[PDB]
Ligand binder design. Sequence first.
Ligand SMILES: [Co+2]
Ligand SMILES: [Co+2]
Lengths: 48, 48
Amino acid sequence: DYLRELLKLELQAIKQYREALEYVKLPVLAKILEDEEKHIEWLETILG
Amino acid sequence: DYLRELLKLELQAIKQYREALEYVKLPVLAKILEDEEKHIEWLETILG
Ligand SMILES: [Co+2]
Ligand SMILES: [Co+2]
């Protein structure tokens, strides 16, 4: 569950860095974004 | 605004990752703190 909630905060993180990338195209949001996709997989493996 | 939002997210995040890293010491989670630690760095720069 805590793992699950970080699984969703990370999820949320994705959708927002997504939109914001969409509107300001700062390369840097780009890189963090990819780090949150990672956090996801790390989470998923740990998770269900 | 979206910048402050992102800021808040990661501050949210950094906070739970810590408790989680607290309750059970899985190096993955700290590996994720350092990431969220870079992002906040970066968010701060964009925020100047
Ligand atoms: Co993350
Ligand atoms: Co982050």
